[PDB]
Amino acid sequence: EEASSTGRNFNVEKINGEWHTIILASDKREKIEDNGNFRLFLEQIHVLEKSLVLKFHGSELSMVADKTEKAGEYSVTYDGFNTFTIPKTDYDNFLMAHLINEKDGETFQLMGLYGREPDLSSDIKERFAQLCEEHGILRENIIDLSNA
Numbered sequence: 001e002e003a004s005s006t007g008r009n010f011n012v013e014k015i016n017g018e019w020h021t022i023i024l025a026s027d028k029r030e031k032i033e034d035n036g037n038f039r040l041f042l043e044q045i046h047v048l049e050k051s052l053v054l055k056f057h058g059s060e061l062s063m064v065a066d067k068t069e070k071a072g073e074y075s076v077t078y079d080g081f082n083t084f085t086i087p088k089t090d091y092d093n094f095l096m097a098h099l100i101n102e103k104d105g106e107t108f109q110l111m112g113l114y115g116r117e118p119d120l121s122s123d124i125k126e127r128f129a130q131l132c133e134e135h136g137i138l139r140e141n142i143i144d145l146s147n148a
């Protein structure tokens with residue numbers, strides 16, 4: 001079974017626990033390149049009543065994302081103001097996130113593919129490339145980080 005965070009049947013509790021950054025994508029590639037502030041390696045998502053605690057490394061980094069007024073959307077302050085949703089997850093293998101960052105009057109889109117294991121199948125990675133395409137993000141702006 002698959003779900004979107006904005007969908008009626010989304011079960012947020014089911015995204016709790018271990019996750020790993022597998023692929024990141026951005027319409028501003030610099031943000032996820034070697035010195036980019038968004039080249040972050042997820043470790044876990046802790047689901048709370050009205051928020052998600054996101055644990056990364058990039059040193060250890062912890063972030064609290066709060067529910068917004070629209071179901072399935074969360075906001076967090078990090079290098080600007082961010083809002084994100086989860087357009088597709090199967091809970092047990094993969095999680096695809098779409099994030100909008102606003103900083104200094106500008107914006108960019110970040111997309112992420114996260115896995116329960118430190119890597120994912122090529123088929124799932126292809127589905128992620130398709131989702132990026134739907135959001136106007138070129139494959140050349142998709143960076144596989146599973147070997148990094």
Ligand SMILES: COc1nccnc1CC(C)C
Nearest residue numbers: 038039040042078084097112
């Ligand atoms: C600030 O968020 C992020 N930063 C870097 C990579 N991925 C995300 C998305 C979260 C939802 C896992």
